[PDB]
Amino acid sequence: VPRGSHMPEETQTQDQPMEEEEVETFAFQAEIAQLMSLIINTFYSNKEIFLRELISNSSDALDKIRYESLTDPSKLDSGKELHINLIPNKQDRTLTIVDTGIGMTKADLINNLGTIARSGTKAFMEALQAGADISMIGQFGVGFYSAYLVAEKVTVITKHNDDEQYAWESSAGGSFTVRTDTGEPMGRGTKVILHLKEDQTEYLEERRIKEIVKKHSQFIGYPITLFVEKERD
């Protein structure tokens, strides 16, 4: 059956075997769940400090690269730049904070992002009740959850040298999931994807992002870059 030309659908290659991703669901530690509901459902002045908290966590993870090289010098051989990228996507209403820090293992995600108690949680909720500024959250050891000031859902994609790539996700409500992530390999580090609330889209705007970086995050110690999607004609 001679052919001289085939159509695209004919020479489309058969799919790669379907990947299985294992998913685990966990309850937040009880006081972390209470804090998340307080953060989500209360009006605060000064919500913009969420970005300072996430940049601080990236900066901590980057500092760990430098020090882990003292017990494991092979990290010196990585050609990856130590940096942070901020990536607003107006199409999808997401703000992503990307770093090339150490990343998290699966058990790091489960323990550090929601199942282990933090000793400051109860004191912080009392300080908030008593009218403290939400900015105080970092000093109480619970800064990550500031993401929920502006995001309705948070997805964390991460890769640590000692484990495979994982995705953590929570829309609050008391639980989170951790699953293996067989999609786009992101390389060592962490991506925090903020699915912004509808009234918090200012944090997609170039000027607003630059304003709050300059106000709150001037001593990162690593390059930070803002990716701005070109406005279409």
Ligand SMILES: Nc1ncnc2c1ncn2[C@@H]1O[C@H](COP(=O)(O)CP(=O)(O)O)[C@@H](O)[C@H]1O
């Ligand atoms: N970008 C990132 N890279 C690596 N680990 C991160 C991270 N963001 C958060 N984490 C992990 O999440 C933990 C909780 O962060 P918090 O900001 O809530 C409290 P703290 O440990 O920074 O004082 C961090 O200790 C770290 O283990």
Ligand SMILES: [Mg+2]
């Ligand atoms: Mg922190």
Ligand SMILES: [Mg+2]
């Ligand atoms: Mg520092």
